[PDB]
Amino acid sequence: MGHHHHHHSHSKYAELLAIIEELGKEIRPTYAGSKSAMERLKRGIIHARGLVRECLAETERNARS
Amino acid sequence: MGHHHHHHSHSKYAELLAIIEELGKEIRPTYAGSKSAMERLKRGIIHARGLVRECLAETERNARS
Structure with missing residues (x-):
């Protein structure tokens, strides 16, 4: 509970x-x-996927995959 | 043609x-x-949103601002 989004x-x-x-x-x-x-x-669906692939290209090397 | 994902x-x-x-x-x-x-x-959207909050709050502890 907390209807207050982060900026x-x-x-x-x-x-x-x-x-x-x-x-x-x-x-x-x-x-x-x-x-x-x-x-x-x-x-937004395509735009969101763009951020996920920015995050994956980073975090997948930063993991072990 | 980027249909092939990574494992x-x-x-x-x-x-x-x-x-x-x-x-x-x-x-x-x-x-x-x-x-x-x-x-x-x-x-799918409420599930996805939940995944983003888990990693956002974690990056909120990691990165400052």
Whole structure:
């Protein structure tokens, strides 16, 4: 419990969270046949994957894989 | 052509990738008005969001600001 998001600092993670919390909102209008919402949904989904691949290229070498 | 992934390292980022790319598909049946699809999309998004908070809070202890 705590309706108080952290501010978007210079971080893959702060942005990655900010994207995915947005994408959950745009499900309702996308399902309701709204073409602007499905665009925002897709836009963030690809943008999020971009941060995940930045984080993977880093953390996979930093792990042992 | 970047469909080939790496062997998923024991990490939430690897699982996170697998979710978010699949959400890219989930846009199509959700927008179509499939009630099963909006539930898959949302389930994936709240799961993904949880993974990001786990690694964000951990990087909050690691990195300063």
